[PDB]
Amino acid sequence: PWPASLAALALDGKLRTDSNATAAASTDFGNITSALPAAVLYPSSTADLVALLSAANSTPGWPYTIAFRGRGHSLMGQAFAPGGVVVNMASLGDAAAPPRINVSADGRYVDAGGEQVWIDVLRASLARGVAPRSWTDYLYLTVGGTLSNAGISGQAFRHGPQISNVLEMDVITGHGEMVTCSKQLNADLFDAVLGGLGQFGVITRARIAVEPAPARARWVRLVYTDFAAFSADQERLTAPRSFGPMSYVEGSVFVNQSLATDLANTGFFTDADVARIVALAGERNATTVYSIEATLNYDNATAAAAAVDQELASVLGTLSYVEGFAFQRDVAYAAFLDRVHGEEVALNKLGLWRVPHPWLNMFVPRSRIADFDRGVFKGILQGTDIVGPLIVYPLNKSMWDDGMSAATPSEDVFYAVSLLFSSVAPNDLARLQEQNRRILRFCDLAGIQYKTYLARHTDRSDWVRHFGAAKWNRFVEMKNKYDPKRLLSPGQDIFN
Ligand SMILES: *Cc1cc2c(cc1C)nc1c(=O)[nH]c(=O)nc-1n2C[C@H](O)[C@H](O)[C@H](O)COP(=O)(O)OP(=O)(O)OC[C@H]1O[C@@H](n2cnc3c(N)ncnc32)[C@H](O)[C@@H]1O
Ligand SMILES: *[C@@H]1O[C@H](CO)[C@@H](O[C@@H]2O[C@H](CO)[C@@H](O)[C@H](O)[C@H]2NC(C)=O)[C@H](O)[C@H]1NC(C)=O
Numbered sequence: 090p091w092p093a094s095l096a097a098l099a100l101d102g103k104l105r106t107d108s109n110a111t112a113a114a115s116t117d118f119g120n121i122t123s124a125l126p127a128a129v130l131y132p133s134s135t136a137d138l139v140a141l142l143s144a145a146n147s148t149p150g151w152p153y154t155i156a157f158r159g160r161g162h163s164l165m166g167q168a169f170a171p172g173g174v175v176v177n178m179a180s181l182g183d184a185a186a187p188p189r190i191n192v193s194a195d196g197r198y199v200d201a202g203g204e205q206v207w208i209d210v211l212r213a214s215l216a217r218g219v220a221p222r223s224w225t226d227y228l229y230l231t232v233g234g235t236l237s238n239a240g241i242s243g244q245a246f247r248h249g250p251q252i253s254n255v256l257e258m259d260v261i262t263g264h265g266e267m268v269t270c271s272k273q274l275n276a277d278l279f280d281a282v283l284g285g286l287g288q289f290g291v292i293t294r295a296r297i298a299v300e301p302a303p304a305r306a307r308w309v310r311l312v313y314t315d316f317a318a319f320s321a322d323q324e325r326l327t328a329p330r331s332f333g334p335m336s337y338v339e340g341s342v343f344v345n346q347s348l349a350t351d352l353a354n355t356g357f358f359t360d361a362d363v364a365r366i367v368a369l370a371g372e373r374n375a376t377t378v379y380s381i382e383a384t385l386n387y388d389n390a391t392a393a394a395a396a397v398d399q400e401l402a403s404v405l406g407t408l409s410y411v412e413g414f415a416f417q418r419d420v421a422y423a424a425f426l427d428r429v430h431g432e433e434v435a436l437n438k439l440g441l442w443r444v445p446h447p448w449l450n451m452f453v454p455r456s457r458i459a460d461f462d463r464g465v466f467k468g469i470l471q472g473t474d475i476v477g478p479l480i481v482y483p484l485n486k487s488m489w490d491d492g493m494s495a496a497t498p499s500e501d502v503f504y505a506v507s508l509l510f511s512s513v514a515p516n517d518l519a520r521l522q523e524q525n526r527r528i529l530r531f532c533d534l535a536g537i538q539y540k541t542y543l544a545r546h547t548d549r550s551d552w553v554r555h556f557g558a559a560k561w562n563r564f565v566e567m568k569n570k571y572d573p574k575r576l577l578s579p580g581q582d583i584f585n
């Protein structure tokens with residue numbers, strides 16, 4: 090039997106089972122795994138979501154797991170619902186009204202539908218002179234999606250991840266109940282959902298903190314051939330004072346084998362800059378080159394430009410990059426934030442976007458980042474053709490709320506390490522997958538207490554270790570309370 094409201098969804102053509110629908114909801118950015126759902130729901134309102142989850146909750150024997158597809162940027166099927174129902178969240182934003190994104194009248198925050206993509210949140214905010222404070226390097230991800238993980242970028246060292254910049258949310262639990270939550274109201278659900286990997290319910294609305302929108306960003310890159318100086322300077326630029334001047338701090342690792350091409354492909358360096366760095370590498374006989382990437386946001390004030398210069402000069406004076414290897418650019422804030430989009434367009438035209446992405450993402454405690462550098466950047470990765478950026482930068486644990494579901498290392502400072510390998514070569518996938526296993530293996534044997542990010546484990550003991558035994562029990566308590574039938578986001582392979 091079907092509850093009337095559920096059947097109504099089918100009657101309205103919102104519940105599709107046609108191959109076209111199921112197929113589109115069966116692959117993800119990872120392009121490594123796939124799983125066909127039984128059906129796909131195209132909700133036109135949150136009420137439709139209530140109908141589905143309510144049916145599931147009251148219908149004894151309900152056999153359909155439910156996933157919430159934002160844009161499907163998952164790497165290993167976390168957004169799939171094998172033989173179940175995949176919710177096409179984007180459908181909530183089809184109507185031209187009411188708006189799915191509203192900047193508060195006082196301009197202190199911005200309400201956004203869980204299905205909205207950050208790029209649109211940005212535009213709507215800027216139209217009101219404001220903008221979120223914490224981002225992701227790539228803006229075409231949904232609010233609910235990044236919030237179910239963490240949401241990190243170069244601003245996280247000072248503002249914390251995106252999950253630390255949410256005032257409240259509207260969530261529909263596995264029981265089918267629409268609940269508003271925050272630190273004050275239904276705090277247990279609030280904490281569970283942030284970094285919750287879609288296990289407790291679907292986020293239909295997130296109240297995001299904002300700040301007055303800067304107009305421009307002085308964008309700089311500093312080059313190093315010495316990892317010690319490189320990491321010491323990143324830690325200096327992101328150290329708690331309150332934080333330094335820098336609005337954003339990330340880093341890059343370039344292996345010597347493809348140095349010229351990788352530098353040229355940053356879209357930041359000129360061919361003249363490239364020649365100099367290539368020469369530097371040969372002079373130091375380096376197998377790896379490192380580059381800090383930072384920015385200083387400022388506005389259109391008449392004195393801004395000159396004020397930024399002095400500020401920048403002061404900071405640079407405290408660092409240790411190779412003499413003369415500071416490279417500057419100045420762009421509009423929105424241009425900087427949406428910088429990766431151009432790379433997507435280019436890669437797609439080359440047919441190098443819709444390829445397997447065996448990405449390795451993790452948080453590495455600062456005390457062992459040097460060992461990681463030796464074992465991976467100067468070791469395992471040497472002698473291979475690398476396609477994709479190798480991102481490395483520190484984060485401050487103090488800006489992370491350990492009460493939330495997201496898992497992080499115990500040290501006060503830990504690094505976000507993102508090796509974005511693209512399997513462009515023929516069947517070069519199997520090799521990259523083995524390489525990632527080797528890297529993880531190296532870390533386990535060296536005793537490095539890392540945490541994976543954006544990865545889904547397939548063994549219960551792995552998830553228990555991921556969260557930590559005690560934090561795991563809390564995760565389970567929240568599971569039994571909000572999704573007792575264990576139907577939500579089965580692709581995480583936690584309770585499925
Ligand atoms: C493809 C990609 C991903 C990416 C990135 C760049 C690219 C090209 N850059 C990132 C960055 O700089 N920083 C960061 O923290 N993450 C970055 N990502 C990874 C991205 O965050 C993840 O892919 C994330 O999952 C968001 O992607 P998306 O919004 O497309 O979501 P999904 O993959 O479809 O679903 C992920 C899981 O979340 C659950 N989910 C989705 N929406 C909701 C809502 N509204 N409520 C509750 N749960 C939700 C899904 O069910 C799934 O399990
Ligand atoms: C954005 O603001 C609009 C109002 O300015 C909200 O619109 C209401 O939305 C609910 C359901 O979401 C409807 O039942 C009401 O009829 C709508 N009223 C209006 C003015 O049309 C909307 O909910 C807000 N969305 C966000 C981002 O929270």
Ligand SMILES: *[C@@H]1O[C@H](CO)[C@@H](O[C@@H]2O[C@H](CO)[C@@H](O)[C@H](O)[C@H]2NC(C)=O)[C@H](O)[C@H]1NC(C)=O
Pocket residue numbers: 345346347374375376
């Ligand atoms: C960095 O990579 C370059 C290749 O881009 C290496 O240069 C090659 O070195 C071999 C033997 O030393 C020569 O036979 C090739 O002709 C060189 N290629 C070039 C650039 O023409 C270089 O040795 C590497 N440096 C380090 C420190 O590993």
Ligand SMILES: *[C@@H]1O[C@H](CO)[C@@H](O[C@@H]2O[C@H](CO)[C@@H](O)[C@H](O)[C@H]2NC(C)=O)[C@H](O)[C@H]1NC(C)=O
Pocket residue numbers: 374375376
């Ligand atoms: C330039 O750097 C290279 C690479 O770090 C040095 O070559 C390594 O030398 C050690 C010990 O001599 C060997 O164990 C490695 O196998 C070598 N690297 C590889 C794989 O080729 C080289 O000695 C340095 N140049 C000098 C002598 O200054």
Ligand SMILES: O=C(Nc1ccccc1)Nc1ccnc(Cl)c1
Pocket residue numbers: 226227241429432450478480507509543
């Ligand atoms: O993905 C990125 N960062 C990231 C990704 C996943 C987790 C954490 C950070 N950065 C990035 C930069 C340029 N091009 C692309 Cl495709 C991606």
Ligand SMILES: *[C@@H]1O[C@H](CO)[C@@H](O)[C@H](O)[C@H]1NC(C)=O
Pocket residue numbers: 115116117120121122123443444445
């Ligand atoms: C990966 O992408 C290719 C090209 O679009 C597609 O043919 C293939 O079915 C995809 N595989 C997976 C596992 O999604």
Ligand SMILES: *[C@@H]1O[C@H](CO)[C@@H](O)[C@H](O)[C@H]1NC(C)=O
Pocket residue numbers: 218303304389
């Ligand atoms: C900054 O100036 C540019 C061009 O003068 C303008 O487009 C932009 O709207 C300004 N930023 C603000 C405060 O909106």
